[PDB]
Design an enzyme around this catalytic site. Structure first.
Site, PDB file in Angstrom:
ATOM      1  N   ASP A  32       0.803  -1.211   0.000  1.00 46.96           N
ATOM      2  CA  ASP A  32       0.000   0.000   0.000  1.00 46.96           C
ATOM      3  C   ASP A  32       0.835   1.260   0.000  1.00 46.96           C
ATOM      4  OD1 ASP A  32      -2.217   1.659   0.228  1.00 46.96           O
ATOM      5  OD2 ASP A  32      -2.630   1.129   2.304  1.00 46.96           O
ATOM      6  N   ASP A 211      -2.002   5.315  -5.502  1.00 47.71           N
ATOM      7  CA  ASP A 211      -2.312   4.411  -4.398  1.00 47.71           C
ATOM      8  C   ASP A 211      -2.427   2.951  -4.813  1.00 47.71           C
ATOM      9  OD1 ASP A 211      -3.069   3.170  -2.130  1.00 47.71           O
ATOM     10  OD2 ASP A 211      -4.755   4.511  -1.710  1.00 47.71           O
TER      11      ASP A 211
END
Length: 334
Positions: A32, A211
């Site tokens: 992430d 992201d």
């Protein structure tokens, strides 16, 4: 050399394999770039939804090197559920290397399905005061020279993607990597200039978080509401009181959307990336409203599969180029 890891496509996200502790307990956690903490699922955790222990668990009691830090970890979600645990430290194995005394959270109750390797900036840690997260520690312990990493999620349907810590595979993109400054004081966000979705151009002029942890992409109503009409996306309820944009599961996925950033950078994404299979007989649009979802604008995995991205946390830049899918490899230090 540069530490590197395969990334395993799971559907909603990509997993990175990390082992923890004296007994090298294996985990698979979400890679992430939109968060900054490493956390794992405790072997005795209470999963609030289904089975959260299919991607590994951690038993602190069986690692002779584990030490609890005693401080609370908790994060809240929009649905008002949470993940809760306690910070600790141990030896971590990732990217073919290891780091000692790394701080991470051991989570004892969660509503999600998997732990997370947050590789973002220290500014988005869920901690106060700040601490050295994994990318910082990799540099401090001499495993990489620069706090930077390159992301190659690879093609839809590829065997794996790759993350390279401290290095860049110059074989895996076309043209030149174009360097963008960050436009957030906390996120790995760059300015999106414009979006040309199959000939329908929209001006943007706002920052988007790049992201890896997010399946699809989220843009403001100023973009998605008119574009939805041109492309055949339509709002439907999803419960309990929420709505999403849906799209025909079976249309000819002809055309592309191009995303233009500053300094001439442009990434082209096939329209197939904007039809996502859902709780089925239904497909959601691969763009959604950041306003409705209450998130900053985000370019997620559907975009990232089509870019080679170098995140440079020391220089505070993100560099972009159109991906080139190849087994050829030529890796240099950043």
């Amino acid at each position: 050399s540069s530490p590197s890891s395969p990334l395993y496509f799971e559907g909603p996200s990509y997993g990175i394999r990390v082992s923890v502790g004296s007994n090298k307990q294996e985990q698979q956690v979400v890679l992430d770039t939109g968060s900054s903490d490493f956390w794992v699922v405790d072997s005795s955790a209470s999963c609030q939804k289904g089975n959260c222990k299919q991607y590994g668990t951690f038993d602190p009691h069986s690692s002779t090197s584990f030490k609890s830090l005693g401080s609370s970890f908790s994060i809240g979600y929009g649905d008002k559920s949470s993940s809760i645990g306690t910070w600790g430290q141990d030896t971590i194995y990732l990217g073919g290397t290891s780091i000692t005394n790394q701080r991470f959270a051991d989570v004892t109750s969660t509503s999600v399905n998997q732990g997370i390797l947050g590789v973002g900036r220290v500014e988005t840690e869920s901690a106060n005061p700040p601490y050295d997260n994994v990318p910082i520690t990799l540099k401090k312990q001499g495993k990489i020279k620069t706090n930077a990493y390159s992301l190659y999620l690879n093609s839809p349907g590829a065997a794996t993607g790759t993350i390279i810590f401290g290095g860049v595979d110059n074989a895996k993109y076309s043209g030149k990597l174009i360097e963008e400054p960050l436009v957030s004081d906390r996120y790995l966000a760059v300015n999106l200039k414009s979006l040309n979705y199959n000939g329908d151009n929209s001006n943007a002029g706002f920052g988007v978080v790049v992201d890896s942890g997010t399946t699809i992409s989220y843009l403001p109503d100023s973009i998605v509401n008119d574009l939805a009409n041109k492309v055949g996306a339509y709002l439907e309820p999803v419960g309990l009181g929420n709505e999403l944009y849906f799209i025909d599961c079976n249309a000819n996925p002809q055309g592309s959307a191009s995303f233009t950033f500053d300094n001439g950078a442009k990434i082209t994404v096939p329209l197939s990336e904007f039809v996502l299979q859902s709780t089925a007989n239904a497909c959601v649009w691969g763009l959604q409203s950041s306003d409705r979802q209450n998130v900053p604008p985000i370019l997620g995995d559907n975009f990232l599969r089509h870019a080679y991205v170098v995140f440079n946390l020391d220089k505070e830049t993100v560099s972009l180029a159109q991906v080139k899918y190849t087994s050829a490899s030529s890796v240099s230090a950043i």
